[PDB]
Symmetry: D2
Subunit: 308 residues, 4 copies
Amino acid sequence: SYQDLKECKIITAFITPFHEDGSINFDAIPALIEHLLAHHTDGILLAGTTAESPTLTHDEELELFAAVQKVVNGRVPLIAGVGTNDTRDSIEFVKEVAEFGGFAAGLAIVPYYNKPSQEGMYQHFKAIADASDLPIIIYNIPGRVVVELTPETMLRLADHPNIIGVKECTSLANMAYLIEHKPEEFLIYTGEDGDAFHAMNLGADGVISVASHTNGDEMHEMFTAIAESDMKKAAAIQRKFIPKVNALFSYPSPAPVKAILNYMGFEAGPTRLPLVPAPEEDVKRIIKVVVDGDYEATTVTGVLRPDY
Amino acid sequence: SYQDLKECKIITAFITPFHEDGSINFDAIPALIEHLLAHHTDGILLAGTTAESPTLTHDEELELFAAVQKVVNGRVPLIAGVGTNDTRDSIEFVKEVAEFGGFAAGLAIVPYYNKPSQEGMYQHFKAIADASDLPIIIYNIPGRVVVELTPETMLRLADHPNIIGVKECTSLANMAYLIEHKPEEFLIYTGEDGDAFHAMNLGADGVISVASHTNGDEMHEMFTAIAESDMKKAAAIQRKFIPKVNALFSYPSPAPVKAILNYMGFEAGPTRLPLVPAPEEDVKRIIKVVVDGDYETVTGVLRPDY
Amino acid sequence: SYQDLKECKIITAFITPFHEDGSINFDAIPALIEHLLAHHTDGILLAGTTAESPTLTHDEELELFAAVQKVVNGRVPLIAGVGTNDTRDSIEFVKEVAEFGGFAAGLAIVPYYNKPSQEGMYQHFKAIADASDLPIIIYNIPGRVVVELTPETMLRLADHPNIIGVKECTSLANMAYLIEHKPEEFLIYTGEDGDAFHAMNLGADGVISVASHTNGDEMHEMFTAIAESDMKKAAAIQRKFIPKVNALFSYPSPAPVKAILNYMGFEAGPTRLPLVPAPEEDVKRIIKVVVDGDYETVTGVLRPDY
Amino acid sequence: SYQDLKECKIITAFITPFHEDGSINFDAIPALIEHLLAHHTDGILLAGTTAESPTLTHDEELELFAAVQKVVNGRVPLIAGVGTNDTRDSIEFVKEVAEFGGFAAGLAIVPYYNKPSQEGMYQHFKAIADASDLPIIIYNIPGRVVVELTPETMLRLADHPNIIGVKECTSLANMAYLIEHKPEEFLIYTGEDGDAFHAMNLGADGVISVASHTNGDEMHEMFTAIAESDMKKAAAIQRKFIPKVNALFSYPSPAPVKAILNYMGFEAGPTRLPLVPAPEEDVKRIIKVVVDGDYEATTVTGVLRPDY
Ligand SMILES: [K+]
Ligand SMILES: [K+]
Ligand SMILES: [K+]
Ligand SMILES: [K+]
Ligand SMILES: [K+]
Ligand SMILES: [K+]
Ligand SMILES: [K+]
Ligand SMILES: [K+]
């Protein structure tokens, strides 16, 4: 529900740990989940992009939700990534995730690849919102999907009772507009770490974050500053925060965040093809820049999920 | 193989006809296909983007491959859409297709959504080309998938002996470079009906077309003018073809092409959500522009959940 | 100097009122100016883009600088547009302006049309800052001039002791970096009324505004809310200001701003060709959106050739 | 007139030679002009971008037209660059260039910097076309000016009796359209060397060229092939032509062309600020790539026109 999510400020988009072997590392999950709740994660998004959802099987996403809900045991609310670029597959998975339980909302991306029109997107998300007990949060991101929902289409959807929010990654003009015209019980999250500062100042509810894995504190610190009206501290953190965000996305994500989470001892392991891990030479620069660690280095292989 | 496709000039990116209830209209396939082979389709690509592949299940795609192959009967070579943005799935499907047989190649798109690096794209396409008997054509289309293979990575892949060409949708600058440096047994298709004139001029092997569904004849006349060194005529055709291609892509494909095909009697049906058919006011514009037809809210459909 | 401008929050990019016959309306200047100083203009930029500088002759610009300075009388500091895309002309004009006196700085745009490299931009701006007593503010606006100063070249220039700031129209990412690494005695203005909220939040020194002509008060209220750490109120103001900025730039500036100023009695007049006034149907939209006014083909004018 | 220009295929956009000193090198002009007419230049454009027109004075452009017409002595037709982003200054210079004589047409760029609307551009070019005996050719180039004339505005203008053509640098779709709907006595030139092949196949009249300075022959060779219907030779030249075009624009033009013209012994000299010459390290790669010369190399300074 909107209620479960309402107070969230730092929703983390949780990675999927893997072994050298390509299988999921369910073992590394407990320590990672603890680290997040220790470093100001308000809520967890499961099986999103950062989780390499395109490469997780149906049954693997189900394993992941059980494994994380066991280890979170109710402590923060959760959102499941449910949408694909097929409306029927999205209807089926969400009704299924409604049954499964433990989620405050299903997240549904604007369809990638097939490039639907605004009416197409409207009828898409309506059908997914219609389908299930689980309300929906729309993830609008032309930087990954080419097309986008316009604010007008988005606010058409926001009126659906079962559509409770948006993870918006367009422009701060668009974001301003959405915050300005939102109906009630409708939540506006930036999905851009490097904008979170501006989105919060403008009246957004929060961030659905990658950088929260490795810089959750300084992000907390900046948000508290906005809330406690210390704009000088908030902007100082923001100015030093931007180059970290850029390093975390300087190779295709979640490669940079996994490499940092690997240095930090969390065995995030590699990425499943078609993603490959960050090159060693980038790996050192990145750890230095994002967590001011020193990486004592030593061509790079992505992994496939077991054939068997 | 490369042999099988060497000669194709117009390989058509075949639609999937759907019933008003959202099931495949398998009945419409024989008429539609004969119409293609009647209008200078030399080769057919099944379950590409224009087939609404994101919306076709595993089994549906297999059942399309049956229907089409039964009708085609080896009259032209066939290409199966096999790649997705998951490297393992793509491997498992290219094997199942190689096994299925009757395909000269599999088409594998550059991964959408997850935005791999070049090196990621190389490992992806290498693994697919390593998986099976079936040769691979890469589909590079940053207007659909955001990222793109640089020519440089493309040419590295061109060296894999089981990768035999590219459907290239980037720039004519890139397409020139690829023609220039291509190795042996590597086909270069444009995937952009609008630029097919330029691509063929520049030395491409042909076009993987949507337009060929409705405008095969004039495409044939242009390619013939081009190969007969009749440029004034090739370019007269190209200059008037541009708006028709434009119209075809003026609501998201394959809406406009189904709306024309429906108008020509072929029962293309509607599109599966998230795509919706072309709006009414637009349908008329589109027919008038593309086929010179006289025609007269919109509802996308779902696959049956039973 | 830097001193003179340290305190400015709202420096307005002053229009040039024109008569229907295309000569400067010098009569309108006193009323327009008093109106700015009445509405929280802290500093004025004369013969910037909004003044239609491409259309003002050398002597006209000098005569504007007279008129305005006579009216202003040292109540606020002044900035003269001095740079063009020719480095020699810019040098000769910044000297003539330094000589003219009464200006805290000269504004020099990144060269338009000829698309210099970074190194070319450095040599350009260095020579201008070397030429005269008069300090230099750089104007970086790739949406007008195509190329842009990277932050890196910008910070090299920031070190010249006669370059004292930037009117920056690139991205908030760049604007953050510049605030963070700025040396001493270097002012950072946003030139984007739309992003002024974000820029001030991020630690900018203020805005070089068009909107301040018509909406000075609410801009003042926002900047005050911001500096009084009243964010909910700052952002309420910003969220409703965005469409007004949008409207102001909805036909090419300064058409929309003159159309509003005309409606408020100020005789801004039309624009000099190649710019034409806002079309009629648009003028009404614009007034309603920007000032909440109730209003009711278009003709751009030429400077007299006699 | 349209007649003077009608048969032109390779219009060169002539550089402005300068001394180390910043003054124009009128001495180097004769040899450069000869080289062009020796290497298939059909027509010469004077005082365009390639000529660093933004940095030429009024009186310097007048010197240039006299100096080139003396040395061309009638042999090819000529076009003068007359437009600026001020309509009055453009009216005055063109009426003046009509008086001056020896030009087949005045070239007028879509106004840069002030970003006019379509009506604005329309009224702009109408006024310049109205002003003088010299007909006008429009130079539409958003890559330098941001804005552009749409085909609809452009064809509105093409109907003016005194507007005889366009140097179009947008897309080949746009170019196709213009060739398809042109009125009579209206000429379509690409201003893109790297597209000239495609523009010619599509039915364009010609190219207004930079690369013609240093690769005029191979350009002739490709155009003859199109005309004589040998498409295989034309495309072979095109494919090897593209990387030369890219090197000629790999540093801000006319820096790369001047550096090659400097290696070839023509003393093009440096560029006037804000342009600077090409870096040495780029200078060798460029000469190699464009004219397969070997540059025996030896931080880089742009020059100002004399203060005196
Ligand atoms: K999945
Ligand atoms: K709702
Ligand atoms: K499928
Ligand atoms: K191969
Ligand atoms: K001026
Ligand atoms: K300074
Ligand atoms: K000039
Ligand atoms: K004409």
